[PDB]
């Protein structure tokens, strides 16, 4: 059959709706070679980091903590490389990513969904149907935010104005 | 982790290289922090 | 000796002289060396079995 997204491209054949958010889009054929659990692991991880980054880029413009000096987020990266806070964040992410390595091994061995860490403290996933719609929304937001974060950082480079101030000006 | 990959890491050349690289590394570190130990200091 | 028994070899020119093997079969004919003994070490030729006479084999 044909891909739902691209009508004239054939369906990849490793993508038969097994993973939510599948629209049959995979022209370069990475699912014909590589494991889709690993690729969905990577898609959801990149997407969650990007979603947090876009929220951070905007909120950091709106507010910053009193103990830290006020500055733009790219300058924040460089300041906290030299200050020590960046190493703390890198270390704690690396610490969590150790048990993430264990989690990815559990996914490869079949006993875990690729983005599932059982992280539902506030019980928002009331029912299975609600979870399916929520994870479709998570996939769509994750992809959209990857595009968005690239835009903010690259535009900041080209025009040295922050995202809220760039919308505010021009 | 896969048991066949762990069985590969248990093979003699891998363990030999890892063990003596670890051995070499703590001799190097001990001579970095405590260099020129010609005698037991006493 | 008996089959399945553990034996200490006493042939001085054996590769397995003063080591333990296991008795495989014992011939009943007029054979010069009727006891078949298997070992876990291979010899220099890579053989792990040999025939011996009763006098050459002692039980352990």
């Amino acid at each position: 059959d044909f891909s739902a997204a691209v009508p004239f491209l054939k369906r990849p054949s490793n993508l038969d709706g097994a993973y939510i958010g599948d629209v049959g889009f995979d022209p370069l054929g990475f699912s014909d070679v590589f494991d889709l659990r690993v690729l969905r692991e990577a898609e959801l991880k990149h997407g969650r980091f990007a979603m947090l980054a876009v929220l951070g880029f905007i909120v950091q413009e709106l507010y910053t903590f009193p103990f830290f000096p006020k500055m733009a987020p790219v300058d924040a990266h460089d300041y906290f490389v030299k200050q020590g806070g960046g190493s703390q964040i890198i270390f704690w992410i690396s610490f969590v990513e150790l048990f993430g390595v264990v989690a990815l091994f559990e996914t490869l061995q079949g006993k875990r969904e690729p983005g599932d860490f059982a992280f539902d403290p506030l019980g928002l996933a009331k029912d299975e149907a609600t979870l399916e719609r929520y994870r479709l929304a998570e996939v769509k937001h994750a992809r959209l935010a990857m595009i968005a974060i690239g835009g903010f950082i690259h535009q900041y480079w080209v025009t040295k104005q922050t995202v809220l101030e760039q919308l505010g000006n021009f | 982790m896969d048991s066949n990959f762990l069985k590969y890491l248990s093979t003699a050349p891998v363990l030999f290289t890892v063990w003596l690289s670890f051995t070499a590394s703590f001799i190097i570190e001990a001579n970095r922090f405590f260099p020129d130990m010609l005698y037991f200091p006493m | 000796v008996k089959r399945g028994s553990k034996v200490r070899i006493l042939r001085k020119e054996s590769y397995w002289y003063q080591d333990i093997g296991t008795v495989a079969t014992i011939d009943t004919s007029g054979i010069r060396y009727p006891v078949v003994v298997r070992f876990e070490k291979v010899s220099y030729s890579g053989v792990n079995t040999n025939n011996f006479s009763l006098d050459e084999v002692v039980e352990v």
């Binding site: 150790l98 048990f99 989690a103 559990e106 059982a118 | - | -």
Partner: protein, 194 residues
């Protein structure tokens, strides 16, 4: 069959909820390679040493034996100032305690040879405080928890004495934040040495 501590991982085998402090926390699966009896002996031993050590840092800050050799508020300085002869006496006494209390079954191959031997149970109850079997389970649990808490706390106290050259509660009462110019972490290969 998922872990209770780590909900997205499977429950590790050799962890069945029998032991006190068993919450299923073994993500790296050390218990699948190392026998759980040895691991519980080592956990109880580390924790007991740390419980005494954490109390040692705090009390050594407050109360001292007489004499100038024992007047070291900062605990990392007490190591160097306290008489060497007596410190090595402590070390030798610890070695004799280790061989006798374990009854010459000290090696990984021989300890627990006796089926009566229990992890962490050396027979130490001088005042028979564990005579009541009703209190046994919560005593075992609170010993395990005090040991874990004290491992973390002593680790913090030693490395905060390294960063700030102050005894722990005096550090809390005369607190100074890290400049970040000093105590740089790593860096031996970034500058290519020197």
């Amino acid at each position: 069959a998922k872990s209770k501590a780590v909900p997205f991982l499977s429950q590790p085998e050799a962890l069945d909820g029998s032991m006190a402090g068993d919450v299923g926390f073994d993500p790296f699966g050390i218990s699948s390679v190392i026998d759980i009896k040895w691991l519980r002996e080592s956990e109880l031993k580390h924790g007991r040493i740390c419980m005494l050590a954490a109390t040692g840092c705090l009390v050594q800050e407050v109360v001292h034996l007489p004499g100038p050799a024992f007047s070291q508020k900062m605990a990392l300085n007490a190591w160097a100032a306290a008489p060497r002869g007596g410190m090595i006496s402590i070390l030798v006494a610890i070695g004799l305690i280790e061989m006798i209390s374990n009854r010459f079954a000290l090696t990984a191959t021989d300890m627990f040879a006796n089926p009566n031997r229990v992890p962490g149970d050396l027979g130490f109850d001088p005042l028979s405080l564990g005579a009541n079997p009703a209190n046994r389970a919560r005593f075992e649990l609170s010993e395990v928890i005090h040991g874990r808490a004290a491992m973390m706390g002593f680790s913090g106290m030693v490395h905060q004495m390294i960063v700030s050259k102050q005894a722990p509660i005096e550090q809390l009462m005369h607190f100074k934040a890290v400049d970040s110019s000093l105590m740089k972490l790593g860096g031996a290969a970034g500058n290519l040495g020197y």
